[PDB]
């Protein structure tokens, strides 16, 4: 089989569509996701047209192998699609009708500076490769573009899944490629992080300064490095879900800003007993008293300041 | 090989079948369970007709390539599942009897509000697409639906196994689409988190509450902290048995609440040393008999309150 | 190709064999295990018979293509087993002797109860289904049941292989079913339980006892809760080594009883200092020295009666 | 079909070009990672030579099967590349024009001396095995390498894909093969672990050393054991994302310097309070006066000293 | 087809070779390894023989299918090996030389006795079945045995790769087979275990002593305590590093007997303080000073007597 011949110099126009089935496994740390979705394919092969009257039917049905099909790839892959052919019809003009079911596993670059509270989207590269007898060059068929109802990804809201109707026309190898960007728009499900990660890091910092209205040293080295180890139990769970980033993320700099707060605070606590044991507490009691005000309007101020640098 | 014609405009009935053998691998976190079942299906097809007299058969073997067959898919899937004919029955009238064992990750989700005293419905679902000759229609025949008694699911009960025998008919990229549901219910053997989370979890809690029959603050420091570090650990524990929901679990606002508890516990131990310091243990010993009183009471009622709202 | 005719409808026999060349990968929270096997299958096929002093061969070796075969499945297995025939050769009166080594994952639920001084029954279920044409029925060939001398399964001992005669012959959905069963019998290799889980847990448990030959409640209070987190610690390695159960297993049992000792030891060292404030320390003494007796004789009893409930 | 036969007295000249698409899944521990490329090969077929003049057409597309191809592996593969052949083109004097898209994981060993300040040459080693006809030579075509804009290997840097245009030529067991270098340098983007890993466990050691302005052995033993505790913790969390070397790493010498630390730290407490036991507090004094200036300054000059001996 | 007719009582002798190309994933705890090698056979095919002079070639090249070939077989191999044939060629007298290219996940038991400075046998059996025309038996062609010099098996150094020359010829399933024992010696490369497990462990225990020259309970309590954790954390990393063993490994006992050593110092801690409250420090004092001496000299000791037994 050999591609169809142009009737004028005009580029073989390949139309398009995704209708996505399931959107499953964003995992964050691979930067990767799975899909399992139609693939909509439709050109003019006027070798193939007949006429409806003579030949007694409306359509034509295809096996893959019998007539030329367009070598359609998808660029951010893993691996090859894993595809089943559907149906490929034939309408008396010689427009093919070609549809397949895939599944692949796609790379998907994240931005994680906002996270949780981040969106994404997520591209799926549409590619053709021209061959020697003709350029061959994408569109988009809005009508084949789309996404089941029930399609959910577990802790993500799906906002839209678009293409971009322009494709990006190149050269590679000396052979003109014509590539689609599919859009997959995604914001993060930040609920659960507020109980599971936020909130007990907060509780075991309020729990730290409470050695402000504590003269016990002793008890004070207790507070201040307890509640330290936890901290770093939380940094240590947190940075098992993210992948290595060359930014600070948004929960990356809370928990970094708060082992400050700690060192701080052990400062202020050794500073403390230091003056206790020279015979001068009532200029530790004006440290102490001080620290009580400073560290949570310092922490409240700090802290605007990181949610406006990062939102 | 093409659809067979209809006597009049009527759509083709393929009626269907799933046998449960094996059930395994429901993973929580991905929402996934594997099966391993029998797909029955059973169409008429008057173009394999044959004479039992001539042939000398009373029913026709055939290889799944010899034959028309329909392109059943499964809608809920990660990837195409993994089928072995096992039987292609034909009778003298063209009723053909198909059976393929296959194996299936599918894709269901599941609701972790009352998690782990839960119940889930697993679905299954059974499609075919219409083609341009003629549409396909999908049916129960209620005698191939059922499961092997042995079948067990890990950590949970299995209910039942029946199918919603309406399909869903509707349009897809403009054709006919024939989808059947196919419904496992199981209930969760919360059993084992009694003994591994719930008591554990209550005794270190309990444990904090020594502290209101002690003046020792430093004991009482080591006391509500140790035990708070402890409980963190159990928090950490359970979510990564679990996926991020953008709700509240019945198990994560009891983990979350005991937090509180923590928390006050921590302001009441620094509350009773301030003031013995201060030189008034009266007072002291006032809120620590009340928190004795308190801290049991507000802790039944407020479970009383989080079950009511969840159950 | 079709079934060998019988000579009446007495059913067509076809003689199994499983000779076990590998064992591995026996995962206990998921209950499976793989298998590395020969299976071997004999029947007689009348059409295949021919002459032995006409033909001058013996035997007569057949491409599986090329000849009727059982379609014999395994009941409890994740996947398809992966297969590759050996041999298949035929004697003069018509008897098939059939060989392929196979690779499969075989599900096989485990009972945790005694663990980890437990015993399992691994089972494989061989499987035929009847066609239309005769009713095809499995025996054992005990001379073709095995195992390997070299065959290890890490960390158990394997005790014995067998096959249960016997099939159990079945209808299910309209046509015979034929199951055997092969049974690997194996018991847990405990030895490694005891330095590095059994004996820890007692020598952490034993130091919180040291507590009650002392006064000091800052000193018992470290002791008792540091030992507990230390006890956490062993609960949690524990379960991640275990399926969720819907019962007690013996380490369990154990484990959630250790839990009540630190409790009641906690209660104690409260008690004790209590008593020490409320300037009693006569009364704090007679609870102390009926600890140091009460505390091991409680619990070598409450370990006699655990191991006897489960053994 | 059969190898071009040569003119000359000449080995069989393939040219060859590898280009990135997609490079993910650089495994540190398992020193792999994971590519998606395309392979282009061209050579001399006389035997496939046309008149462009007669024939009308420029070039002449032809199938894999109907053409002789040469058998090129990678050696470094963990199994056989997932190929799937994009176009094949041959010009009037018989050059053909070979182009697969493949994907592959690669083995290539890392150096982990600079960790995390390490840069590595990954290797792509391409291999054709000499026939008996005639012996096959390998070269490198530098218009056909390359690699895309969008390639990124997350938490490293690409810095250049080049190939060692001189192949490896020797022989493997009777033959001539014909080796080539596909390299493939990165630098490991060493920001995340400012955060995360180095100063988090710079501000514990550095709170380990407020027991230097401290008299209360039982706060200093508090300081220096639970900070260590937490050391061990970052520890381990950097060897589980490293592989086990036979030689130092940057941070694993860090790491282990830091022990010592806490060592000296924990005898200079117990020095520090047998000495004011003994009722030498002038001298106890005098020890931990200078502890406050030689830990720091032994600190910085042992980094410094060991940046020099890594860097 | 068929195999090769004997001239003579003589069995057919297949000569292997392995030549390893890449070595990978040594799993301690699945006690597996990958290997990606060539497979070298050899034998004799009179039915293949021809004359040089009329044929015009000196070698006959032929496809798998076109002759017989014996059928080779791994003994230890999860799945059967991912093979792909290089190359057949057969010489006048009809000597075939056939090699292909595997990739197989190898089951070869490991002694961790001496871990981590253990050496271990890997196998690799190559078998094969005897048919009932003749006797297959397999041998060693040492001049294609061997490994390329790039061959790293990461942590671990390669010493040889050698073949048991003489088969083990037996009786399976009322067939001969020929089984011969290919051997990959390696020896842990130990160097990472003494600064990331065996010093640090070291550290813990000898801060642990450090309470042999206190007075204060309360300080010796959290010395001993916190630094037993920590060594917790040690048994636990290094029991997730290896599978369950019936038998002690070095490491293992080192870890196990270090448990006695904190028992006992707890012992000596609570010894001590019991004594100092019953008003008899100078006894106190003797038991104090003698386990300054016992506690290292006894460690020492038991680490002869350990290293001893094991080496
Ligand atoms: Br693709
Ligand atoms: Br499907
Ligand atoms: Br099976
Ligand atoms: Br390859
Ligand atoms: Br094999
Ligand atoms: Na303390």
């Not at 149906?87 to 549809?99: A, E, K, N, R």
């Not at 959910?152 to 000396?174: C, M, R």
Request: charged content about 20%; some cysteine; aromatic content about 14%.
């Amino acid at each position: 089989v050999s591609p169809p011949p142009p009737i004028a110099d005009e580029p073989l126009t390949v139309n398009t569509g995704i209708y996505l089935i399931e959107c499953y496994s964003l995992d964050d740390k691979a930067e990767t996701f799975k899909v399992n979705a139609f693939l909509s394919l439709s050109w003019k092969d006027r070798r193939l047209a007949f006429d409806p009257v003579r030949s007694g039917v409306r359509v034509k049905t295809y096996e893959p192998e019998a007539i030329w099909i367009p070598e359609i790839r998808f660029v951010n892959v893993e691996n090859a699609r894993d595809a089943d052919v559907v149906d490929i019809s034939v309408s008396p003009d010689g427009t093919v009708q070609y549809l397949e079911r895939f599944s692949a596993r796609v790379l998907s670059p994240l931005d994680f500076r906002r996270y949780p509270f981040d969106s994404q989207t997520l591209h799926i590269y549409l590619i053709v490769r021209s061959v020697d007898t003709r350029n061959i060059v994408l569109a988009v068929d809005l009508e084949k573009v789309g996404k089941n109802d029930d399609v959910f990804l577990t802790g993500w809201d799906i906002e839209s899944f678009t293409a971009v109707v322009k494709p990006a026309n190149f050269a590679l190898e000396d052979r003109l490629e014509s590539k689609l960007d599919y859009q997959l728009r995604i914001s993060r499900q930040y609920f659960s992080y507020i109980p599971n990660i936020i909130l007990p890091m907060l509780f075991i910092l309020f729990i730290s300064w409470t050695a402000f209205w504590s003269t016990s040293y002793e008890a004070n080295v207790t507070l201040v490095v307890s509640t330290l180890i936890a901290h770093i139990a939380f940094n240590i769970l947190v940075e098992t879900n993210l992948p290595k980033t060359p930014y600070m993320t948004y929960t990356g700099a809370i928990i970094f800003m708060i082992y400050l707060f700690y060192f701080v605070a052990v400062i202020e606590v050794t500073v403390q007993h230091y003056l206790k044991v020279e015979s001068q507490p009532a200029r530790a009691a004006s440290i102490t008293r001080a620290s009580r005000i400073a560290f949570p309007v310092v922490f409240l101020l700090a802290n605007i300041i990181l949610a406006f640098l990062f939102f």
